[PDB]
Every structure is written in structure tokens, then in C-alpha cells.
Amino acid sequence: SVVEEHGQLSISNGELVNERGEQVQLKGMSSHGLQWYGQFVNYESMKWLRDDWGITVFRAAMYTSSGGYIDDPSVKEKVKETVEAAIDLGIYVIIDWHILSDNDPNIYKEEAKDFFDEMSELYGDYPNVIYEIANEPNGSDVTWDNQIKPYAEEVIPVIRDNDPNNIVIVGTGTWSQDVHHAADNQLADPNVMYAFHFYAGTHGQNLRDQVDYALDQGAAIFVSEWGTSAATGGVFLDEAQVWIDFMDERNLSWANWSLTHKDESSAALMPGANPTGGWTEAELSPSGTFVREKIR
């Protein structure tokens, strides 16, 4: 199992590494909003993803608003089911506080704190857990220096009282594209990474240059969400492939958006796909077929 092979992850010299200090690259899938598409997230589907697609990380996207956790906190229990499954299956799991329409992470920060205190108390002694404390900060008035970093410096200590070394992923400005500003004003915690998110049908060479810059500043970057579609023509597999090779050349870890059979180009599944896995190439979307291939 990948967790038996690599164990406790850390950051060394801006790179994700295993418990012996060797470089590692995680690849896998993200759930869609747990409050909408939680049926595709369960032991059997994750096991199918582990065995059939070869995923080494699973991302649990728990929305805060839009009928998420703040609206109905019951969804917390689905996060727990997912982590427990990952522990059983021997894979890494991201716990994602999926802010979006609530565009400043400071809006529900007290609730964030309570939630991450609970999760790090429950699972902080396992190496499988990665915390993603603010999915996609956005808005021209939400900046690294003034909003996101101070939020981070409030949430990371609560986690660290329970879990001193698992990785924390911190979102960046403009729907997590602006890794360049975080890179100029990095966090003190040594086991943190900055999120970078793209859409293959929309994002180009300027973004790759910005990623390269952050890496040159010694910042570690996790591509915790990307799609094969345009941000807002179907799928763009040529541009997707350029992005896969870029990530591979820089050993970047990633999670593909979304494990769902939603009628959007980014969805991996066709309507009718069984929520407990075992999918044929029949039930995989053109997106799903390409990603499974990249991961295999």
C-alpha cells in the first residue's frame, strides 16, 4: 500500500518527501461537494479507485456554504467515514475545508478552528491525513498578506497542538492561482504547501511561469484541484497533457476534479455509473478515461 511504502510525509527543501527523505508524488481524485455527491464516496469506490486506477491520494471536498457544513454540520460524519476508509485502504486523504462563495477564509474561521481541532485530535496520530484549510480564496480584496496568511497563522497552531507534523495545504489568491505572492511571504511552519489550481481548457504559460517562480523561491506546491475542462468546448486533452508533463517534470502531486457523474465536462463518470465502483470504460466520461490513464 502506498502508505506502507512511504509513511510519514514531510517537506524538505521545498519538496514532498517520505519518512526516509525520498521524493514522492501523489496522484488521485477529488470528490465533488460532499453535500451533493457524497454517494460516490465510500469504502468500495475508494478501494476500486485504489486497485483499478492506482490512486495514491483521495480528496474529501467538504463545502462550508452552499448547503455545506455551516448550513448542515451532519456532513462532518461523511468526512470521518472517508478518512477511516483511507486508513483502512492504506492511502493518503485530504480533508478539504472547501470555501468558495464564502470567498474570505476569515468569514467562518472560528468554525474552521473548531472543525480542525476535532479532526486533528481524532486522526493526527496517523500519517494518512493532509489538511487543506481553505480551498479557494477569491476576490480582489482577499490577499495573501492581509487575509489568507493571518488566517493560516490562526488555524495552523490549533492543528499543531494535536498533530505536530502532518502536511497542511494552504489556499492562495484568485481561486488558488497566485502562488507567486505566497512564495514571497511564506509561512513559518515547515510542513506546509501552497495550493495551485488550474483548468486545462483555460490556463496557460503565464500560470506555469508563476508556478516555477514559487518553486524557485523554495515554496512547496500541491495541485489539490484541477480539471480537464475550461474554467467556465468539452475537454481539452492536448492542453491537459501539457499540464500533466509539466507536473511530472517538477514532481508535483495532484488531485483531479471531480468523481461525479454530473453533466459537466470535468465529471469523471457517466450517468449510471455505480456509486460503489467497478466501472467499465463505458461508464467513464472522456475526462474520466484520460485521468485514469494518467494515473495508471
Side-chain angles (χ1 to χ4, degrees):
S1 88
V2 74
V3 165
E4 276 163 2
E5 198 190 340
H6 289 117
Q8 180 67 232
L9 311 172
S10 56
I11 303 307
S12 171
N13 300 320
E15 304 189 290
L16 186 67
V17 293
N18 65 192
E19 56 173 44
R20 298 170 292 289
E22 305 165 338
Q23 290 192 223
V24 302
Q25 195 189 201
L26 266 18
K27 293 176 170 168
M29 290 299 301
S30 190
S31 74
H32 202 294
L34 255 17
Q35 82 270 210
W36 296 321
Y37 302 102
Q39 74 261 208
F40 290 103
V41 187
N42 50 259
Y43 178 83
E44 285 302 316
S45 68
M46 300 179 44
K47 185 194 200 167
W48 173 257
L49 284 164
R50 187 196 65 181
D51 290 354
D52 188 62
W53 299 27
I55 64 161
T56 52
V57 64
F58 194 81
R59 185 184 191 240
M62 188 191 77
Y63 278 62
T64 42
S65 203
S66 264
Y69 182 71
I70 307 304
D71 297 329
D72 170 28
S74 84
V75 70
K76 168 164 86 205
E77 307 306 322
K78 190 54 159 187
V79 174
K80 283 179 190 183
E81 163 184 359
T82 308
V83 170
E84 282 174 22
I87 295 170
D88 282 343
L89 287 166
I91 61 168
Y92 296 101
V93 59
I94 303 179
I95 309 172
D96 158 38
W97 183 259
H98 203 272
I99 77 174
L100 188 57
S101 76
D102 52 323
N103 62 295
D104 183 345
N106 290 284
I107 305 170
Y108 298 127
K109 150 184 83 94
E110 279 322 304
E111 290 91 352
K113 284 165 90 180
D114 296 332
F115 173 83
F116 277 116
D117 177 52
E118 181 163 15
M119 298 296 288
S120 56
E121 190 170 42
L122 286 180
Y123 307 115
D125 252 87
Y126 295 79
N128 306 246
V129 176
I130 299 165
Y131 306 97
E132 177 170 11
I133 56 167
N135 168 51
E136 281 185 349
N138 58 96
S140 50
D141 85 294
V142 174
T143 69
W144 178 254
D145 293 359
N146 299 319
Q147 287 58 232
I148 307 167
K149 177 167 199 226
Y151 164 85
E153 291 178 339
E154 229 180 302
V155 177
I156 294 167
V158 167
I159 294 175
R160 285 291 177 237
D161 199 42
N162 293 149
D163 179 349
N165 25 236
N166 281 329
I167 305 301
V168 176
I169 302 171
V170 183
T172 56
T174 313
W175 290 276
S176 283
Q177 289 162 208
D178 293 354
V179 288
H180 31 116
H181 318 96
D184 285 339
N185 188 20
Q186 290 174 48
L187 292 156
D189 194 278
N191 286 305
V192 300
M193 303 176 91
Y194 307 93
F196 178 71
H197 293 178
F198 70 94
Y199 276 94
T202 299
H203 298 308
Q205 191 56 46
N206 67 314
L207 274 230
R208 293 192 277 283
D209 293 341
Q210 282 159 194
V211 166
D212 268 329
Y213 173 83
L215 293 168
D216 288 338
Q217 305 309 294
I221 291 175
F222 204 112
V223 183
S224 60
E225 191 182 300
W226 64 276
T228 50
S229 66
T232 260
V235 303
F236 301 76
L237 298 203
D238 272 5
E239 293 92 325
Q241 179 70 44
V242 168
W243 274 108
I244 289 289
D245 293 328
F246 171 88
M247 294 191 289
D248 281 345
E249 237 139 39
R250 277 137 263 243
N251 217 39
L252 293 184
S253 296
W254 57 255
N256 179 73
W257 183 267
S258 201
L259 221 229
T260 191
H261 56 16
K262 180 158 183 232
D263 204 59
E264 65 192 354
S265 292
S266 56
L269 302 179
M270 308 273 289
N274 195 293
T276 59
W279 313 305
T280 61
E281 235 98 285
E283 298 142 280
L284 287 183
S285 73
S287 186
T289 295
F290 173 82
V291 173
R292 157 169 188 294
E293 219 174 293
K294 304 304 102 172
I295 304 187
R296 278 170 137 289

